[PDB]
Amino acid sequence: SGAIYVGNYRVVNRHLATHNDWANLVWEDSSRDLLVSSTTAQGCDTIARCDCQTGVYYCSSRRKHYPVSFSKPSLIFVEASEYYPARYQSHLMLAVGHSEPGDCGGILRCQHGVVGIVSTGGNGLVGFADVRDLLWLDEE
Ligand SMILES: O=C1C=C[C@@H](OC(F)F)C=N1
Ligand SMILES: [Zn+2]
Description:
This protein has one helix at residues 19-23, and strands at residues 3-6, 9-13, 25-29, 34-38, 54-59, 64-69, 74-78, 87-96, 107-110, 113-120, 125-130. The protein is mainly beta. It has a 7-stranded antiparallel beta sheet with strand order 6-5-9-10-11-8-7, with no helix packed on it.
């Protein structure tokens, strides 16, 4: 589990969105595994605006933050998980690291701020849904 809180937006894995998220929907994209809902209180997070390929992510299944190198966001085939069938997921970054389903929502951060959230795992990789292209998160 986990979210990004930027301005009056809450960014979650689409597959973990709640009824309240869907009832306060701003934007969602199944292909990206992302959903954004509106918040009453302003959030503590700054979104990275950059093309970094190195950062640190939080792994809840290890209670640990790991430094990683990661691929640039791309359209990637993802094997079946507990929460999606095998499918193509867009805007996905991969790193070598540990990820189980419940690790989804852990933040990946670089020197510029929040890069994305854990969205995929298995076979020794961790996949992160990028948010750095979502410039509208920074305003309004
Ligand atoms: O509705 C879902 C939830 C999990 C899933 O995975 C599959 F392989 F079980 C697929 N779709
Ligand atoms: Zn960066």
